[PDB]
Design a protein around this ligand. Structure first.
Ligand SMILES: Cc1cn([C@H]2C[C@H](OP(=O)(O)O)[C@@H](COP(=O)(O)O)O2)c(=O)[nH]c1=O
Ligand SMILES: [Ca+2]
Length: 129
């Protein structure tokens, strides 16, 4: 897989961010994770975590996987990097997202994210507490 440039337009919630990608505004949904909705327990914490990570980054990148690049809502499906740190992994490692929505062909980083989840769970962090 390959990282490509994007710039932040606006944080939205724990697992969706508005980015400008090839010059066009798009809502991106993070691959392989599910954060609580803002109205649910840990939802505001997930939103805050992703907001801080993308707003503080000097460089955001998106990385598409091998399969579908947009979902049925027209959201981009990618892994997101903030100064080289994967947002998807960081949320899972902090117990603010569960690994989820693991569809065949878009699952390159599944085992990396499962390993982070196992660690967050061993630590009883957030959702796992
Ligand atoms: C993460 C992800 C979500 N989706 C769709 C499945 C779910 O459909 P439904 O809306 O019918 O439940 C929805 C979940 O996204 P959210 O967690 O953002 O609600 O997005 C994909 O199709 N592919 C993906 O990789
Ligand atoms: Ca969600």
């Amino acid at each position: 897989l390959h990282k490509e440039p994007a710039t932040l337009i606006k944080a939205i919630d724990g697992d969706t961010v508005k980015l400008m990608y090839k010059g066009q505004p798009m809502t991106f949904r993070l691959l392989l994770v599910d954060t609580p909705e803002f109205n649910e327990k840990y939802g505001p914490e997930a939103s805050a975590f992703t907001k801080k990570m993308v707003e503080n980054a000097k460089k955001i990148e998106v990385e598409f996987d091998k399969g579908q690049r947009t979902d049925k809502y027209g959201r981009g499906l990618a892994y997101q990097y903030a100064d080289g740190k994967m947002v998807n992994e960081a949320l899972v490692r902090q117990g603010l997202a569960k690994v989820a929505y693991v569809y065949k062909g878009n699952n390159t980083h599944e085992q990396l994210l499962r390993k982070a989840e196992a660690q967050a769970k061993k630590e009883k962090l957030n959702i796992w507490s």
